[PDB]
């Protein structure tokens, strides 16, 4: 559920 997946 990270909302901005690319930020991982």
């Amino acid at each position, epitope marked *: 559920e990270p909302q901005a997946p*690319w930020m*991982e």
Partner: antibody
Amino acid sequence: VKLVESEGGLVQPGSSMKLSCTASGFTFSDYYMAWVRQVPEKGLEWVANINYDGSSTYYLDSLKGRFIISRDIAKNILYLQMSSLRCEDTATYYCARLTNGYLDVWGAGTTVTVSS
Amino acid sequence: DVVMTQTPLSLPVSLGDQASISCRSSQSLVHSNGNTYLHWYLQKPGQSPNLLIYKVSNRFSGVPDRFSGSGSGTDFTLKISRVEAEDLGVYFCSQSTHVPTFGGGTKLEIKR
């Protein structure tokens, strides 16, 4: 339901301006938010996004930190501070709600023109 | 820098016929968490983009079952069955698996 951008308009090259976006209808701090811009000829470009409480942000690298995304949780407002503008920043700027990687609510857009 | 390439640039279709729009990515869109963050938006004339399909194949609230997204990896397709005039506009794919980027768009034209 509804994001409304501030009036954009004309700014001199090298000067600064701040857009705002007013959120309504949801718990603002339960969603990430983003700014996206569109220039004719052409193409959408992701500008910035921000997490729930504003402790983590992402910016398009080429902006070189000239842009700041922030949110006033107490007033349901999203900001985009833009510094040292060049003509390449002329565009329609959209406020958007970000959920699980996608933009599920978009504002009406506001145009910013960088010109002398 | 992930490039999203859309084919064709413009697509003319008769009312009631099917439109098929291709979107390819230059890198796999399968995130390490297993999700594929590939989405489709429609921008109608004089309007903001709105979300149509998220995560490859999920229809957003309010989108008719006529709109169907499919694909995996680097190859994706949006299919619009039984086209209606109000479907016209520019369809954009977008990825957010990596630093987010958008396709250049495909213009749906209605034949008369």
